[PDB]
Structure 1
């Protein structure tokens, strides 16, 4: 399959002397790292968040980040201070690596400006996004022909340090990343869709890992009209999900929510509706 590590940076430039930097490290969609802007240090969120890396080499990484954040910010401020009507504006960066079975690791470094793609690091070249403006061509030119210390560092971080770190991180967090957390489920009666209609609701909460299957059922017959919400986070590193169905007042009887999740070991949660107001007795 596919596995990745990445850093995100969020730079908000409010005026020529006020900007804000934040960022964070991620194992696919699991956050593993914070950044303390105040002190310029890495916040290690889990007890395995150092991977197999020595404190020295993490401390070297943290200093290389401090220099970068201050330097990138100051260079942006130098350009943009020549026109104060450009403010406010936002730059986002996503940088890291991705491994595919049997391949060399692939590195990425992608930049957005005010919520659209601006430019990206493609092998050893910085390349303006399709529909390249003036801005994006100017920056790539500056990066390709006069910040060569920069490009080499970047290259080596995403192509060699990141994969190495990534694999240490997965090794040390093996237990935690593959753990299983069983969900609970419950029903409720959501808002009336119309005259003699009911909205049936099935909540599923506290599940990990993320993949999950929820349908309304009549016996073996999946109910076509089932609507899956988005899978939303809880604050204890689990997930949440509602599944709804619009039914005739009087067709609800016999219907059930069914949940399959990898933590349940084939023993699906099945909740039958009704006959009380909100799917209870």
Structure 2
């Protein structure tokens, strides 16, 4: 059961002197933190988002993030090529940690530039991305050579602070992250597959955790044509799934949607396709 925490940053320079920034913290796919640029502070999205850290550790982290953003803007100006050609551009930073089954922490700090890998932080050095070229090497040279504790602070943050906080988060959020939410299901007609054909859609909405089983059935026979859509997020942390089946007109009768979920405790949801009295 690998679990992960990511701090992500997105910032776009529209031109040489104007940039937008955005940042958030994610426990797996659950957003746990936002960032308020206009005070440079963490937005704790849940009661438990402090995840066992003291106010002192968290404000230290805030100060760290602010020093980081300050250094980032100062350096981006002093080493920007400044020609309008290189604008607009967008940087993405994904930093954080993944805790493996046995407890082994793995840190990461990856950066993309215009949606392409730019560089990551492996062991103790900034590795430029292979597919990228001289921008990657320039940034890595700056980070490996012309800085102080920047590299070592990143190391401790992603290798020690982050797994500690990740675990604190899971623990403080145990009643949320371990909850069960019963889905509801309903049937609809989807986009016509063709003349004389129907698209049966079984919507399953509002389940958590994410593992769900949905099939179109004829009694106990699973219909082979069933397609599962993407498991899509709902607001307030549940999931949504469409299971669809194209069938001939005249072969729809008898088909049912069957939904299994950990929250249903054996009592599968069964909905029979109707469409005509």
* TM-score (structure 1 length as normaliser): 0.95
Report if aligned partners of 2:117, 2:132 keep a CA contact under 8 Å in 1. no
**Distance in 1, Cα, partners of 2:60 & 2:137:** 32
Pairwise CA distance, 1:129 = 1.5
Unpaired segments of 5 or more residues in structure 1? 274-278
Q: What is the RMSD of the two structures over their aligned residues, measured on CA atoms? A: 1.3
Pairwise CA distance, 1:191 = 2.2
Pairwise CA distance, 1:29 = 0.9
After the TM superposition, which of the residue ranges 32-41 and 74-83 deviates more from structure 2? Answer: 74-83
Pairwise CA distance, 1:103 = 5.0
Report if aligned partners of 1:21, 1:69 keep a CA contact under 8 Å in 2. no
> Which segments of structure 1 move beyond 3 Å, counting only runs of 4 or more?
none
Matched residues, number: 276
Pairwise CA distance, 1:40 = 0.7
Unpaired segments of 5 or more residues in structure 2? none
After the TM superposition, which of the residue ranges 46-55 and 131-140 deviates more from structure 2? Answer: 131-140
The equivalent residue for 1:246 is 246
Q: For residues 124-156 of structure 1, give each alpha carbon's deviation from its aligned partner in whole angstroms, at most 9, with x where no partner exists.
A: 011112223111111112211121321011111
**Distance in 1, Cα, partners of 2:47 & 2:36:** 17
* TM-score (structure 2 length as normaliser): 0.96
After the TM superposition, which of the residue ranges 245-254 and 206-215 deviates more from structure 2? Answer: 206-215
The equivalent residue for 2:105 is 105
Pairwise CA distance, 1:70 = 2.4
Distance 1:88 1:268, change over 3 A: same
Pairwise CA distance, 1:91 = 0.4
Distance 1:132 1:81, change over 3 A: closer
**Distance in 1, Cα, partners of 2:162 & 2:175:** 21
Report if aligned partners of 2:6, 2:95 keep a CA contact under 8 Å in 1. yes
- What secondary structure is seen at the aligned counterpart in 2 of 1:107? strand
